Write a protein that binds this DNA or RNA. Sequence first.
RNA 1: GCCGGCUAAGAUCAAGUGUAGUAUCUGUUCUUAUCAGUUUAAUAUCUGAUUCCUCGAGGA
Lengths: 76, 62, 85, 182, 144, 110, 160
Amino acid sequence: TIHSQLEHLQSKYIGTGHADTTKWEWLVNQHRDSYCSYMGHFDLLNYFAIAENESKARVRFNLMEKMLQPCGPPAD
Amino acid sequence: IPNTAHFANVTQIEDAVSLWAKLKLQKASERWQPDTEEEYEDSSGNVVNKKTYEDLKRQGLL
Amino acid sequence: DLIFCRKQAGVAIGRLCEKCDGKCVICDSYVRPCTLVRICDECNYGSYQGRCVICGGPGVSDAYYCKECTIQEKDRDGCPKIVNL
Amino acid sequence: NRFTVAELKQLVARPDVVEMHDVTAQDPKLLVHLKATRNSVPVPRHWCFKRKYLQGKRGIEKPPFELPDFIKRDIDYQKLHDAFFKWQTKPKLTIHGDLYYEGKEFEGDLSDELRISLGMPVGPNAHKVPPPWLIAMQRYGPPPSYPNLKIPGLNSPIPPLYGDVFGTNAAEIDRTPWGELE
Amino acid sequence: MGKDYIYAVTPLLEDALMDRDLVHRQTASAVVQHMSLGVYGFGCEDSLNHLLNYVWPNVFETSPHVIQAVMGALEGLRVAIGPCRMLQYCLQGLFHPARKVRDVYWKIYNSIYIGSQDALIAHYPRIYNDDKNTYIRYELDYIL
Amino acid sequence: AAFSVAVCRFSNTGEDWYVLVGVAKDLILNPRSVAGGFVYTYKLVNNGEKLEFLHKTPVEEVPAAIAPFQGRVLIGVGKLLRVYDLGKKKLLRKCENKHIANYISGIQTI
Amino acid sequence: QDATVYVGGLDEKVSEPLLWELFLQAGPVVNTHMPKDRVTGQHQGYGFVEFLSEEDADYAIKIMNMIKLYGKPIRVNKANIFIGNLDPEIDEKLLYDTFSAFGVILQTPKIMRDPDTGNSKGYAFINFASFDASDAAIEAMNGQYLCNRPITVSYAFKKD
RNA sequence: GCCGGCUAAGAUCAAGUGUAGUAUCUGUUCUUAUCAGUUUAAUAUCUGAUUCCUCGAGGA
Ligand SMILES: CC[C@H](O)[C@@H](C)[C@H]1O[C@@H]1C[C@@](C)(O)/C=C/C=C(\C)[C@H]1OC(=O)C[C@H](O)CC[C@@](C)(O)[C@@H](OC(=O)N2CCN(C3CCCCCC3)CC2)/C=C/[C@@H]1C
Ligand SMILES: [Zn+2]
Ligand SMILES: [Zn+2]
Ligand SMILES: [Zn+2]
């Protein structure tokens, strides 16, 4: 049953998929962990804050605000 | 219409001719056609008229 | 019913018995032990204080992950104690 | 409420990657788009077969194992070690996307042996010894398929010719690599 | 120590991976896994990609031991070869019409995703916006 | 918004130096949108101390890279790679490749 | 078939890349084909060289005609008396001109060809006007030195 | 495998033997048929309906 437990733990981790995963879930997952990776890495945030001419605190707050509904609301 | 991988699993005539029109338009668009795509400035005024194509330049230099 | 515990591991060190002394808990390899095993608090309590993580007999020495499991960061999951249901 | 092959071929930017079953997917537009990514080798092609990935034909009966050339040329001292690490060559390797499948295992200069079997003598120092195919080229003219080819007697001088080289192709920078060991 | 001997055993592993016997392919997969985790940071990616080209067709195997060895070899190649190559091998099957292909590919993808979730950020392919939803990541298109 | 700059000489002209500046027009970053682009040309006179405007050539996308090349200039106009010669009223398009993937961010020539 | 040239008269020293290497100076030979036998498993002396253009095949047929390759009369072409072991460089008109010195020919001769390539099989059949020309061919031509190929003339049908 | 075919290309349902595990063998049958539903990437599968000829018989 070790394989079955692995199949239950892999499902538990947030961001994993399965044969019924849609395009929307996949894309919002990669957008969300992209925003978290931007918040983590110090020189990517530097790049963005120089590009759009904003303070780094403002870019961080904008990314956190975008975290809620990236890619718009779902289908139907 | 040539036999290529694009025209596979296509069994009807009009579908084939329409997809051929589409592929023709796409490829003909994405090539580099120097005859109509080029900017020559003939020495007729030599400081004006850069809208000359590659054919009007020969007509002016003939 | 050979299932890992996979709970948050604490400060308790995993133990191995005389039969399992050189073994790796995850892949059962014997080559290059690399990382000390940690177990959760419910696996280390009362009568469960010193016990083999593989079988459950009286522990005699420290349990280790192998270098192969350490490279793949398989020491970062929960408690690796084998628990039967 | 599902596309047809020709209808979906009209929507996509790359119709030649569309296949029979592609119209039966839950999201064919994303499937065809991922099939066109500028990488990403395709599926192993035997998912729809019914022969368990091992074809029982093609005559797989063959030699067991051919060792490399370095294999053949105490048992051997550090000198034969030197030999094994001087003779070591890189084998043939396939690049990133070349998956294997059941079938894909079977599918002016002349050599000295052919010149010895044909009855042609060796090249002299200063004389004219043409091949018998050069008389037709001297009579009719140079071949239009290879105008840059040179033959001794017609375009190349007689003193040229050296060994088995009876012809040379004459086609009408800073190439040194940057960081390399000395 | 194996970094000097991968070129010598590659044709033998090729032969063993083309074989019909199941133990042959299972053991060759085990060898690939141990070799991959043995050389890591030593620049042996050519032979390992070549061998992945022969290991990958075995993902549609029903025998449990063979598929276990194949998963082990894939997770070793995830470390030695990198997650970008693995994602490139999984992309076209993630959304296949057949449910078997989707199950296998999503298992492999989840294994690739749980380890090195952060690196995958730089490897995802571009996906265009539709009428309803925005999918382009615009920040990465900035040019200083 | 200026994004590229180059100093070069053109073969059809003499030993005069020119400065080319690539400029975007009404660029939005998120969502990305641009109205167009321009290439400015200056003559760089008085022993390299003064710039004097010569003309201004419109392009349909942001020119992000400009590189001198064999007596002419290469320009990356968004996805497009073009060759440009100097003219009396604008820059004259000479050659073009249209198969580069997404967006040209740099051009280098040996 | 037009861009490909059929070569005849190849010995055991000639191989499949050897013909492409020898025909590389004449033109861009794209592929070489050698049909293997069923009893021996080797080439029967006849092969094909598929080039890119028809002019290269014409130059190879006009340059490598009646050549002595590997001790064999190799020749390239556009892809009751019995004569055996004849050279493929000769044609029907050439065989009719060679047979006109002994006796008078009744009609144009015919040469057998392979069902796969169609250039030359190895045997031919020719009919004379009278039996005196057949006896002169069996006395003189049956064993005469042809173009690097010992031919053998024999009677196709004889009644005891 | 041999020169498109000779039914060794697949599925299935009962029983026997045996392993830690995989398995191995026998009888079979294989719809030669149609429609509707389930389902399958598509098959498959399952769920239901559906007088004549010949020499007392057989076949459709
Ligand atoms: C596939 C083979 C099997 O799994 C087999 C090992 C096992 O199934 C049997 C059962 C059993 C109990 O008989 C196994 C025996 C165990 C062994 C032969 C291992 O030996 C030991 O346990 C001895 C002890 O635990 C530690 C010795 C040690 C450190 O050498 C250990 O091996 C290593 O860690 N290595 C491997 C790496 N090697 C190099 C050498 C350079 C510097 C040291 C580290 C790198 C050093 C030695 C044991 C090897 C045997 C496989
Ligand atoms: Zn381990
Ligand atoms: Zn124990
Ligand atoms: Zn625990």
